[PDB]
Ligand binder design. Structure first.
Ligand SMILES: [Mg+2]
Ligand SMILES: [Zn+2]
Ligand SMILES: [Zn+2]
Ligand SMILES: [Zn+2]
Lengths: 84, 156, 93, 551, 107, 171, 268
RNA sequence: UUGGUGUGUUU
């Protein structure tokens, strides 16, 4: 109906900072609610530093749904998008 | 809680409410005729679905009281066991061979097609009474339908 | 936390902070809607757990929301002036 | 957790369906018909059912639960009532649009004085915008003077041939002037609202669709009120005058005045009536319904109170700077703020703000009890609420509040994984920081927490330029996040190191101020020499110095 | 229009990026005529109803909201604030899913 | 009356469930929550088709709460009765006020005023039954009734029958 | 007035309805903070200066590369196979000079706010790679030409492959590619700056990455930042100027107080 | 733990 295949993807393949902000907030909220961490834990035990330790390595199980302004949307995985 | 695709009920007048219109829609938006099921059809689907679910849980390796235990929760065990025994004692065409024969014989509203198969009848007089919707349709063979249906009906 | 504070929050854009400010550290308030006539007329008994849109005989098409209590105040004031805000929870066209 | 559980699932609003209200749907939504002007029974303790304070509307007393929803006052939204007016009235807010509508159509059959025959009208029909559609029909019909009996062999469209009157507006009272015939007596007469109701009930849905309305939402016999609703008393709750007597809200006074004029209407048609005693009591009814929604109408004196003050209408509760929207919804007052007078402190970083201890005691932050923060949070319990660094509450997994000033036994409390604890304002948290008024997108900036005695706010002095603060007594606020989500929102966008460069003028707007600047210019003039000994300290002050002096 | 704004700002030595003035002078000629900044500009747009009501004249424009059966899908900002919603910008211009793709890659 | 119905269920998942078996948990959760339950809108949901292959979709993270919202679409066999619908049944009990007949999931009450006059309740008989001369309605008797009224408790539905009409009665 | 304007994931500028206002954000796609005022060197000066600085000549010996700076200098002089490359590139820059002279920046004031500033990267590589020496280099002219030409098709602002995408791509970064070829032409690099190969490859990769990192971000609520950042000098500010002139320009009057003409006369 | 008016002072 709306959705586009993952090959016509003409939006920018970067994370930008607003996207980055929401990913950090939501991943940190999950790991605050006892979602176990994929990366090592040295001294970074506060959840925001845990989230930046993940995004440093690009280890994030989320999906951006950019609503393109028709209404359709490009399901970008985190794994493919280039971390700034 | 649980919702459907669609976003005074009188079975005699074929008024089935907003949920059971003639044209339904599947989870892709495609148009589809309403799927009304005779007692015999329903017996095949429910029994097939229950044993297929049990096989999938066993990685790929009969009785209704055992087949109803596949469900989860005592409420579901109850409704399914009560439904199988009802279908076990009123489904005329208890195998898919006869069932497809009845399927081709009948294939006319989908509600009537399921009633004619579920309710055994002797004559046309008994069919247009219990199913008063067949009145103004004007296309019988009904009798040989009922005769073939009754002949296809296995003994018990 | 006035207007122009909200303006600079929009300029930064992190509106999730704004949904903290004007929902959660304030008059967080919970209402119900009948999904057919779209209104908040649905009478709420909870320990008996029953509902009735009495202009519709609707007993199933029922949702709750999370709106500011002053927004609800707007709605009751308006319906007491005969304008009908109806809140349908799906895009229609 | 802050709400009691319900089974209807949470969804956000998507579409506002604005529309009008039928008289019907008002009659079908309520629970009670409204009758009696007195509030009390006979001053007898639970006032009169049938008066204005029906407990079936929702009780405005803490200790008597509601008698319709069966909840407390904390949860009951209220329920609408409605007062059956005997005489139908105008809504006060539609009188120009109702004016235009009775400028449009026939007054006998109620039909539009144009069809698709006249082709400019037939072109105006094709418009997808309702508003300028009704403008174009309003334009082309104001010249059309006669209801065509014929189609504009008799093709009788529906009209009788009687002319169409000229619609004046005079406040609440309309004056239609037919050209009752050429020239003969013009009967400029008051358009009684019930006559127009009987007109409006005779409209085809096509004339609804052409004239800028919609049938299931805005049917223009609904712009005349037969039944004016009653809001529940949360919207007019009684105020403790001096803690025994309740002065009422002015809505209660006005609905009492409406119900008094209602009964003095129904008193006249049940006895000998001298025909303008009828007219004045009806016009007084219309007056009371007018001031229920608006006490600002031009030309007429205001509705007045028992002090000499004007009445708080519904219109006065919505317009103005301090109405419900600009004063309560678009912007409002909130909590977890703080406020003081500031002081400079150059012995600081750029993202640090001094926190007086008592403000750290009062405010808090809910840190989630996780599996990596149990020990300190238990210690913050063991400081309790009179000792920084510490805690004030444990919210359980359900919604249980334990105020630790009112609890003897902190020592026997284990905590569970996933409970909630609000500890105090400890170091290194985001705060928002902010000075009224905001003027550019740096005027709110995030920071970090440094805890100091001697109760003022500390700053760096390089941040003095963006907030535009001096130290002759400014107030700067301090909002606090109450979630993890907003913490990361602030820490990645509204932090000072990410807002250095202002797109106002694509330059840094945070620089050097008074002393550091004029001092460094006095320092690195050419003829300035320093001995080694003082230089030891001076290079010790740099946090980023490696450990190597220059040559 | 652009020459006017760049003049009367940069008379007192003050400096402005092009793209901000550009966005202002192009919104002022969105619709083929000068959509000036008053109530007459924005409220005579067919945009979101409460967004237009939040600026001026909220009584009349609410009466024209309910008076003509408008459908406001609430994509304006002021709606989604006063309906207490995830507003559509910043972090909320876009939803976030869970991912069966990467959680299949996970053990 | 049996149908195939395309239904869906909104499931909200707490972040502590964000683990490697998330989709399988949701599929089991759908079955536990939907199978055997009754609603006046669809009827009894008897069994869900193809339960182990249900596509649960992706969970949308709810802003501000961290929890994920799944819309689990599925197709089930549902049974809803109708006023006017003739059905067969098996009588479960007989009492002075009529008899009760099991029509699949639910139970139907036929009162004495909706039983033909020649059928007389005989308690002395063993086993107790409504009897005539060539008619016999005891427990376990196949009967054909007509649903003349459906009442809804949203938990269990209640239907009242009748054999006071043509071609209805014992079979 | 602006409070909803959001730059979406197609580089456009819509309101709540979708009234698109600018097809490309700020006519460039570049974030508003991320500029400096630089010098597009090929605007000013005479034809003598341009033909002396840039015009390569591979037939005449002396107007070529003075051979101290390059290793391969035996392998060069006379080859028309490389001369036609350089004539095409000199005509390229005459096209750019006519372009930036006569279309865009007509009065020739060359200082303009333009993104990522390359000169700083060049001298950063210089101080990294110890770039004195006054030494032969092994970096050839065809590698320079193909580096510039393979740069000018890697500055994707508007990504995708439809015809208006490629057209809007070349409409987008014409001035920025004009900047790069205004600086990194062959005689300027291999005389005035003296790079090596490895410095030049690092220059290419870094101009890639930072003109990627100064694209505007999507969802920058540019109307709101815009409105505040125009209101802010309005705080601290014979023709009317200042606040009433700003008020009249916003609230658009049919009667402003003292209108004016700018009337040129003809050249004779 | 009142409302509602009104006055003076802070940035
Ligand atoms: Mg000052
Ligand atoms: Zn309803
Ligand atoms: Zn109540
Ligand atoms: Zn007429």
């Amino acid at each position: 109906e709306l959705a586009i295949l993952k090959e016509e993807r003409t939006t920018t393949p970067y994370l930008t900072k607003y996207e980055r902000a929401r990913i950090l907030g939501t991943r940190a909220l999950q790991i605050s609610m006892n979602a176990p961490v994929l990366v090592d834990i040295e001294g970074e035990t506060d959840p925001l530093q845990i989230a930046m330790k993940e995004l440093s390595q690009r280890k994030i199980p989320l999906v951006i749904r950019r609503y393109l302004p028709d209404g359709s949307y490009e399901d970008w995985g985190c794994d493919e998008l280039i971390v700034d | 809680v649980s919702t459907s695709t669609v976003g005074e009920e009188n079975a005699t007048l074929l008024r089935l409410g907003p949920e059971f219109a003639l044209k339904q829609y599947d989870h892709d938006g495609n148009e589809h005729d309403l799927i009304a099921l005779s007692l015999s059809e329903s017996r095949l689907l429910i029994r097939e679905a229950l044993k297929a679910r049990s096989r999938a849980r066993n990685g790929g390796v009969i009785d209704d009281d055992e087949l109803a235990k596949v469900t989860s929760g005592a409420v579901a065990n109850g409704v399914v066991k009560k439904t199988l025994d009802y279908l076990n004692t009123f489904a005329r065409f208890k195998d898919e061979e006869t069932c497809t024969a009845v399927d081709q014989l009948l294939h006319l509203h989908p509600f009537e097609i399921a009633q004619l198969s579920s309710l055994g009848c002797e004559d046309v007089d008994e069919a247009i009474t219990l199913i008063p919707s067949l009145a103004a349709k004007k296309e019988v063979n009904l009798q040989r339908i009922l005769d073939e249906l009754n002949r296809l009906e296995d003994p018990y | 936390f006035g207007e122009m504070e909200r303006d600079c929050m929009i300029a930064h854009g992190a509106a999730g902070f704004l949904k903290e400010r004007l929902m959660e550290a304030s008059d967080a308030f919970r209402v119900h809607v009948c999904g057919i006539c779209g209104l908040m007329s649905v009478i709420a008994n909870l320990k008996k757990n029953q509902f009735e849109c009495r202009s519709c005989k609707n007993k199933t098409n029922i949702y709750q929301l999370h709106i500011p209590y002053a927004a609800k105040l707007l709605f009751q004031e308006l319906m007491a002036m005969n304008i009908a805000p109806r809140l349908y929870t799906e895009r229609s066209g | 957790s802050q709400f009691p559980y319900s089974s209807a699932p949470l969804r956000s609003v998507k579409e506002v369906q604005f529309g009008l209200l039928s008289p019907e749907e008002i009659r079908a939504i309520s629970v009670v018909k409204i009758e009696y002007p007195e509030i009390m029974d006979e001053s007898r303790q639970r006032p009169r059912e049938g008066g204005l304070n029906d407990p079936k509307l929702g009780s405005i007393d803490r200790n008597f639960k509601c008698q319709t929803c069966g909840e407390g006052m904390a949860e009951c939204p209220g329920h609408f009532g409605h007062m059956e007016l005997a005489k139908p009235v105008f809504h006060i807010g539609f009188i120009p649009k109702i004016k235009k509508v009775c400028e449009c159509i026939c007054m006998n059959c109620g039909k539009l004085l144009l069809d698709e025959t006249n082709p400019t009208m037939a072109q105006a029909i094709r418009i997808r915008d309702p508003k300028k559609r009704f403008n174009a029909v309003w334009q082309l019909c104001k010249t059309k003077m006669v209801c065509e009996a014929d189609a504009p062999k008799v093709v009788s469209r529906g009209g009788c041939g009687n002319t169409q009157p000229v619609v004046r507006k005079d406040g609440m009272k309309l004056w239609g002037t037919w050209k009752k015939s050429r020239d003969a007596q013009p009967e400029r007469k008051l358009l009684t609202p019930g006559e127009i109701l009987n007109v409006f009930k005779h409209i085809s849905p096509e004339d609804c669709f052409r004239l800028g309305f919609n049938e299931d939402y805005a049917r223009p016999e609904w712009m005349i009120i037969t039944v004016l609703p009653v809001p529940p008393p949360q919207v007019r709750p009684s105020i403790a005058m001096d803690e025994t007597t309740q002065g009422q809200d002015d809505l209660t006074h006005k609905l009492s005045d409406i119900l008094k004029a209602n009964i003095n209407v129904q008193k006249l048609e049940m006895d000998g009536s001298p025909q303008h005693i009828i007219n004045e009591v009806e016009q007084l009814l219309q007056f009371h319904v007018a001031t229920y929604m608006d006490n600002d109408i031009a030309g007429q004196p205001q509705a007045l109170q028992k002090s000499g003050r004007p009445v708080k209408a519904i219109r006065a509760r919505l317009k103005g700077k301090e109405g419900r929207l600009r004063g309560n919804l678009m912007g409002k007052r909130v909590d977890f703020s703080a406020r003081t007078v500031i002081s400079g402190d150059p012995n600081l970083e750029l993202d640090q703000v001094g926190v007086p201890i008592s403000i750290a005691k009062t405010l808090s932050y809910p840190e989630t009890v996780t599996q990596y923060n149990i020990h300190r949070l238990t210690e913050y319990v063991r400081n309790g609420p009179n000792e920084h660094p510490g805690a004030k509450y444990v919210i359980r997994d359900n919604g249980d509040r334990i105020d630790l000033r009112y609890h003897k036994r902190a020592g026997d409390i284990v905590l569970q994984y996933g409970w909630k604890v609000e500890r105090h304002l400890m170091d290194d948290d985001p705060v928002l920081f902010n000075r009224q008024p905001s003027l550019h997108k740096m005027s709110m900036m995030a920071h970090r927490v440094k805890v100091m005695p001697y109760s003022t706010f500390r700053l760096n002095l390089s941040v003095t330029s963006p907030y535009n603060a001096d130290f002759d007594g400014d107030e700067m606020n301090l909002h606090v996040p109450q979630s993890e989500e907003t913490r990361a929102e602030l820490s990645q966008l509204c932090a000072v190191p990410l807002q250095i460069v202002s797109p106002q003028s694509n330059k840094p707007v945070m620089g050097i101020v008074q002393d550091t600047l004029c001092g460094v210019r006095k320092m690195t003039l050419r003829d300035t020499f320093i001995e080694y000994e003082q230089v030891m300290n001076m290079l010790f002050w740099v946090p980023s110095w490696d450990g190597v002096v220059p040559q | 229009l652009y020459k006017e704004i760049l003049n009367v700002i940069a008379f007192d030595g003050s400096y402005v990026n092009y793209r901000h003035m550009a966005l202002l002078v192009d919104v002022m000629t969105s619709r083929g005529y000068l959509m000036a900044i008053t109530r007459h500009g924005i409220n005579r747009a067919d945009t979101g109803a409460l967004m237009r009501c939040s600026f001026e004249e909220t009584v009349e424009i609410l009466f024209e909201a309910g008076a003509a059966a408008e459908l406001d899908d609430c994509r304006g900002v002021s709606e989604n604030v006063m309906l207490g919603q995830l507003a559509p910008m910043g972090t909320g211009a876009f939803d976030v899913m869970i991912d069966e793709k990467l959680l299949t890659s996970l053990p | 009356m049996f149908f195939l119905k395309d239904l869906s269920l909104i499931l909200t998942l707490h972040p502590s469930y964000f683990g490697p078996q998330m989709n399988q948990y949701l599929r089991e959760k759908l079955l536990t929550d939907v199978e055997g339950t009754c609603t006046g809108q669809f009827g009894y949901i008897v069994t869900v088709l193809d339960g182990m292959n249900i596509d649960v979709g992706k969970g949308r993270i709810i802003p501000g709460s961290g929890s994920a919202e799944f819309e689990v679409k599925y197709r089930a066999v549902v049974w809803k009765p109708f006023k006017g619908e003739v059905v067969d049944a098996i009588v479960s009990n007989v009492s002075p006020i009529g008899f009760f007949a099991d029509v699949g999931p639910l139970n139907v009450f036929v009162s004495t005023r909706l039983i033909p006059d020649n059928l007389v309740y005989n308690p002395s008989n063993s086993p107790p039954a409504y009897m005539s001369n060539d008619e016999l309605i005891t427990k376990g008797s196949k009967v054909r009734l007509k649903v003349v009224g459906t009442r809804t408790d949203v938990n269990e539905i209640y239907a009242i029958g009748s054999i006071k009409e043509d071609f209805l009665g014992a079979i | 007035a602006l409070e909803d304007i959001m730059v979406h994931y197609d580089g456009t500028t819509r309101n709540s309805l979708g009234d698109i206002i600018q097809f490309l954000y700020g006519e460039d796609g570049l974030d508003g903070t991320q500029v400096e005022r630089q010098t597009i060197d090929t605007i000013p000066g005479s034809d003598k200066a341009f033909h002396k600085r840039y015009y390569v000549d591979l037939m005449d010996e002396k107007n070529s590369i003075k051979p101290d700076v390059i290793e391969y200098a035996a392998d060069i002089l006379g080859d028309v196979e490389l001369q036609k490359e350089l004539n095409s590139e000199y005509e390229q820059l005459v096209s750019d000079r006519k372009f930036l002279r006569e279309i865009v920046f007509v009065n020739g004031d060359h200082n303009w706010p333009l993104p990522v500033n390359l000169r700083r990267i060049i001298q950063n590589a210089q101080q990294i790679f110890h770039l004195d020496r006054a030494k032969a280099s092994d970096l050839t002219i065809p590698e320079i030409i193909h580096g510039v030409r393979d740069l000018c098709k890697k500055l994707f602002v508007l990504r995708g492959e439809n015809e208006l995408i490629k057209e809007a791509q070349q409409n987008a970064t014409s001035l920025f590619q004009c900047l790069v070829r205004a600086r990194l032409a062959t005689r300027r690099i291999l005389e005035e700056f003296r790079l090596n190969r490895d410095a030049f490859e690092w220059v290419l990769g870094t101009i890639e990455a930072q003109f990627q990192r100064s694209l505007v971000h999507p969802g920058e609520m540019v109307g709101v930042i815009a409105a505040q950042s125009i209101g802010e000098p309005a705080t601290q500010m014979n023709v009317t100027l200042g606040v009433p002139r700003l008020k009249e320009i916003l609230n658009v009057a049919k009667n402003i107080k003292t209108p004016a003409l700018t009337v040129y006369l003809d050249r004779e």
